[PDB]
Design a binder for this molecule. Structure first.
Ligand SMILES: COc1ccc(/C=C2/C(=O)Oc3cc(O)ccc32)cc1OC
Ligand SMILES: COc1ccc(/C=C2/C(=O)Oc3cc(O)ccc32)cc1OC
Ligand SMILES: [Mg+2]
Ligand SMILES: [Mg+2]
Ligand SMILES: [Zn+2]
Ligand SMILES: [Zn+2]
Lengths: 324, 321
């Protein structure tokens, strides 16, 4: 039976390299709903926060609807992938019992909404084309502000407030953490976020059990920011058959943006020129300048928990390099 | 009959409330149309005059008339005040006609569509505004968005004949200025103004020396921040009306914060407020440290302004028995 196979694939929810694309097929193009549902059951979040199962499904279905299914990369499959990757990074041994159930809920919820209603074009495109989104948000983290606004607003639809039984202060603390995390997914913050993570690794403090010692909001939210940031940039760390399909999708989306940029007489953004692009050189540069400096720093923070993930990234980089 | 009050449009202490009544409740439209014919900005940026009027009229309409303080009069006052802190001798042709243009247009839009309540109120009440802007500079983001949005209505693009890079540069500066009017950034903004003063570099003749952009934009941020917090530096009859209007607006919020069960915001409880102690605390802890630093930066220049401030503070303290 179809849902017998889907249920078997959901046994891998705690594993890096989950067949997220097959789960999309087997779930009827609802990877975000079923992976979020599975993760919430796995972490026992429905009982902890008194989330009615029908409210959760209704919100997750409405949230998945607002991801564009005609956008090749930034869609509900990407959201489900980031949710599940964050869920795995949360289970790393070096972070056992570090985070409260509320912080875990915030990081997973942030991963679910982090790209909702993504139109398939970059912030800079939205700025340069004087979009209504750029006009609303004053050219600052335009997409990321929009993902948050949409993600929270959908909680107000009929039977959609999954946080209805959190206390006032739990509400206020979660909303702030979700905002801080999603705003950190803006790539213009990557360099400063990585520099902060480098500083933390160099001054890393650990408890008598081997668990990372987080002392204040500034350190705890910064780790959660980089965790979701790593999950957002985790495609080159996955098994190659998954990585390659992510590369096909982002190039599909980029090339579309370049066709609109050229039609408009604009300068074509890097990697968006389908007449001058090297898919393979772009992935090597993506790994060398962005993904590997980030994941190698994260692996130091949780050493040695992320050695396999770092090994896969370096193998995949070697493979893409060899195709040139 | 209004035009001779407007002859004062260059002095600290413009009788802006008079101009408001003489203009038919249009102080912003007439004070901007005067400051634009005075700095000759309609030529330099080829602004057709009917287009400028059309924008200012639509801008002024989007300030709420039933809001006691954050209305068009306060906007007209901050425009005119920035306009004079722009004619200070130490800062004279250290800003482009475009940078001048940003600081004035920013002052004009810096509170547009203000509902008369604080950011913290909008956050704590799950308002549509706070939901849109993720609890960060909720009002100021909205002031900018409305101010730019109105440029796109019929015959309102007063920046139509700027070049492409000029429009991008003006937009960036206006955004940086208005976002800096958020009071939650006051302490950071003042420490940076002190730092610029601590290792200031002047010529010796008057003018101050800024080189890059991060410090030239900080000056107009603090400048519009000063003009925003310039009520206690104006003559006492003007200051006292501003005090009546802000406490009126605060008391309405405090009422709506009690018909809700919220913690009453500071100075908003009409049954536990000392209007006079609040003004003295406002001066001691916010207005005077800011204007001392501005007057140091522009030494002397703003000594009449700093004098009037400490006069007004002494008087308000004398109203406390
Ligand atoms: C699977 O490959 C990819 C997956 C995602 C992205 C997305 C990127 C994005 O949205 O903005 C970027 C900006 C940059 O400066 C570099 C990469 C990206 C880029 C990828 O490859 C280039
Ligand atoms: C003329 O007096 C005033 C004029 C304006 C304001 C406005 C203020 C505002 O919007 O947020 C504030 C926060 C503070 O911590 C102190 C003052 C203000 C306050 C005034 O007096 C308190
Ligand atoms: Mg994103
Ligand atoms: Mg304001
Ligand atoms: Zn993403
Ligand atoms: Zn103001």
């Amino acid at each position: 039976e179809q849902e017998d196979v889907l249920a078997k694939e959901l046994e891998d929810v705690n594993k890096w390299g989950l067949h997220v694309f097959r789960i999309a097929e087997l779930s009827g193009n609802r990877p975000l709903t079923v992976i979020m549902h599975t993760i919430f059951q796995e972490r026992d979040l429905l009982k902890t926060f008194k989330i009615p199962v029908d409210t959760l499904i209704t919100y997750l279905m409405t949230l998945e609807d607002h991801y564009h299914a005609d956008v090749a990369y930034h869609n509900n499959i990407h959201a489900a992938d980031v949710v599940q990757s964050t869920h795995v990074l949360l289970s790393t041994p070096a972070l056992e019992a570090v985070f409260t159930d509320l912080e875990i809920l915030a990081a997973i919820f942030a991963s679910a909404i982090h790209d909702v209603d993504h139109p398939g074009v970059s912030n800079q495109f939205l700025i340069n084309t004087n979009s209504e989104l750029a006009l609303m948000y004053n050219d600052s983290s335009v997409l990321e502000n929009h993902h948050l606004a949409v993600g929270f607003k959908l909680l107000q639809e009929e039977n959609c407030d999954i946080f209805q039984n959190l206390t006032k202060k739990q509400r206020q603390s979660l909303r702030k953490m979700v905002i801080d995390i999603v705003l950190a997914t803006d790539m213009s913050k990557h360099m400063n976020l990585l520099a902060d993570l480098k500083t933390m690794v160099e001054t890393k403090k650990v408890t008598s059990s081997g668990v990372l010692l987080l002392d204040n909001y500034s350190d705890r939210i910064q780790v959660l920011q980089n965790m979701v940031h790593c999950a957002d940039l985790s495609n080159p760390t996955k098994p190659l058959q998954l990585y390659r399909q992510w590369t096909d999708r982002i190039m599909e989306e980029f090339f579309r943006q370049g066709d609109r940029e050229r039609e408009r007489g604009m300068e074509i953004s890097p990697m968006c020129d389908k007449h001058n692009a090297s898919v393979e050189k772009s992935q090597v540069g993506f790994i060398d300048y962005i993904v590997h400096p980030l994941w190698e720093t994260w692996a130091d923070l949780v050493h040695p928990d992320a050695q396999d993930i770092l090994d896969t990234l370096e193998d995949n980089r070697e493979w893409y390099q060899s195709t040139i």
